[PDB]
Amino acid sequence: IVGGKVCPKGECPWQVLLLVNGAQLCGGTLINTIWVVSAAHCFDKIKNWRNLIAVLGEHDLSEHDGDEQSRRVAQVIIPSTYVPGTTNHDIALLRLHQPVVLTDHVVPLCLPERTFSERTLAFVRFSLVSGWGQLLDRGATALELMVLNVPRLMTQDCLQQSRKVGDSPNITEYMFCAGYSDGSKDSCKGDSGGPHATHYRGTWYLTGIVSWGQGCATVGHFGVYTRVSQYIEWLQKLMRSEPRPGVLLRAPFP
Amino acid sequence: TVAAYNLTWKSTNFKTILEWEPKPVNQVYTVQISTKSGDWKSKCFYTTDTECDLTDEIVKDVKQTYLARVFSYPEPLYENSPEFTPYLETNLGQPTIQSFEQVGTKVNVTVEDERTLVRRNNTFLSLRDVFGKDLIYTLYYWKSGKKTAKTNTNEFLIDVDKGENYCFSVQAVIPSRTVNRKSTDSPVECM
Amino acid sequence: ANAFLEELRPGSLERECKEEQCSFEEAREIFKDAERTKLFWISYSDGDQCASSPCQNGGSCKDQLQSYICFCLPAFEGRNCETHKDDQLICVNENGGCEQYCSDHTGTKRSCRCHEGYSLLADGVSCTPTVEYPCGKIPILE
Ligand SMILES: CCCS(=O)(=O)N[C@@H](C(=O)N[C@@H](CCSC)C(=O)NCc1ccc(C(=N)N)cc1)[C@H](C)O
Ligand SMILES: *[C@@H]1O[C@H](CO)[C@@H](O)[C@H](O)[C@H]1O
Ligand SMILES: *[C@@H]1O[C@@H](C)[C@@H](O)[C@@H](O)[C@@H]1O
Ligand SMILES: [Ca+2]
Ligand SMILES: [Ca+2]
Ligand SMILES: [Ca+2]
Ligand SMILES: [Ca+2]
Ligand SMILES: [Ca+2]
Ligand SMILES: [Ca+2]
Ligand SMILES: [Ca+2]
Ligand SMILES: [Ca+2]
Ligand SMILES: [Ca+2]
Structure with a gap:
């Protein structure tokens, strides 16, 4: 996170830390005691699928406490239409081998119904993005969980307000921009997979996933998040599905 | 579409x-x-x-x-x-001269403080209630030669030659403004 | 207006334009000067746009040069106060006043709903948790 602040321990309870071979890989979002939503590109270069770990209730990577809970990632479901290295359909549904315990420091973010998210949450101006990613473009990552409040933009405005970069990725209907173009605040690489949570009348919902963007807090550019609303049905169906033999699973989309 | x-x-x-x-x-x-x-x-x-x-x-x-x-x-x-x-x-509506009484060699011209759409405590705030000190009223009058007067309230106290008749007109004005700083001239009233 | 021989009498704003409708010429004979006559004629001849009684549902009309302005009652809005604020109970309008989910309904009224882990209160729009740790809630702040 660039230009944000430390999320007081416990105020970002659905934040997931994803590790591979015990190393920091990406962020995630708990949506129930067994499933975690992250970004598909976080797995482009994974080789040891049996070595994926999700940590809940994390906060300070330099100090352990009893609020942390680790769970092997038993399954990574990525859309069949996703292409490693490219931007579209940047989402992944992860099944934990064993449910985590809901506590004051570990709580799931609500997955909203499709239309609610489209007709209401999508117009709530501000939302929170968080993670242990870089604090500066190309800089080092954060020891303490960071959070940032960013404003949402409809794609027409995003395109019009973003300086055309030679053959840049299209902002599809499965994406949406959020952030600032003055180069002061935005999420970053290490935050990938992290939540873009929207607050509406007492309850927080999952509206986006940190996905990509031109650098991090680059002038004339906004951050791009996966538009979760386009995947509500896809996610719900998979969560009611039976586990598969191997770790990686590619499910058709729609 | x-x-x-x-x-x-x-x-x-x-x-x-x-x-x-x-x-x-x-x-x-x-x-x-x-x-x-x-x-x-x-x-x-x-x-x-x-x-x-x-x-x-x-x-x-x-x-x-x-x-x-x-x-x-x-x-x-x-x-x-x-x-x-x-x-x-927001454009200033056309003003309306509320009245004017004579007092020897002086005339008090009152500009009706028109109401706006700004609701406040179940009522409609006046033009004065909203702009306060930013609103002035200018007076364009003549001995029925031009003459003008300005006021930071809703009234003009001007001098007039006893006997002769006068005609008046006023404009709402927000001086600080750059665009739409004046309203149209109010209807003409003659004493 | 002009009646037989009245024109022999000097001009009179009262007698001619106040107590009667006066043409531009009669107005011009009273004010004389070009600008003075015009400044008077724009308002005098503009007509009263509020004559149509355009402001609906108990509104109040305020006349202006070639136009008007409607002041509506609290429960109304629109150029002519034609819009009923109470007739907008649809989902797209502020989520239909629902705390969480909203479902439109042709004819009947919209119905509100809640996310798993919550239940709709008797008020018909609010949701309350049915578990210790419902989604979207931050424990150390509740
Ligand atoms: C870190 C910026 C790298 S970059 O080269 O400037 N931008 C590329 C990118 O984001 N690539 C993706 C991966 C392939 S497309 C899914 C990426 O790095 N994603 C991580 C990420 C997360 C957030 C932000 C941001 N909000 N600025 C940037 C990158 C795109 C596809 O051109
Ligand atoms: C009353 O007169 C005004 C004049 O502009 C017209 O706009 C309205 O439609 C009518 O009711
Ligand atoms: C004009 O204003 C409207 C809003 C109503 O209060 C009317 O009664 C009044 O005359
Ligand atoms: Ca720790
Ligand atoms: Ca006559
Ligand atoms: Ca006549
Ligand atoms: Ca009379
Ligand atoms: Ca007569
Ligand atoms: Ca003549
Ligand atoms: Ca005459
Ligand atoms: Ca004549
Ligand atoms: Ca008029």
């Missing part, structure tokens, strides 16, 4: 209406309005008119700067409107 265009703000005394084009054909509209850091609020749902009254929304804080956008239906196509800061841009 076709995106709306020529979005214009029609506002007088804070009665603010957004208008646009074209005359809908197989397409309806929905407007959204907001302050830069506020959420978007929808208005005039699936209307077939090419206008939308936003008075109730903008009078909540006339010093804020609002942006509105018109959605088009057969993310949907839309068009943003110019930013609009009520306090700085």
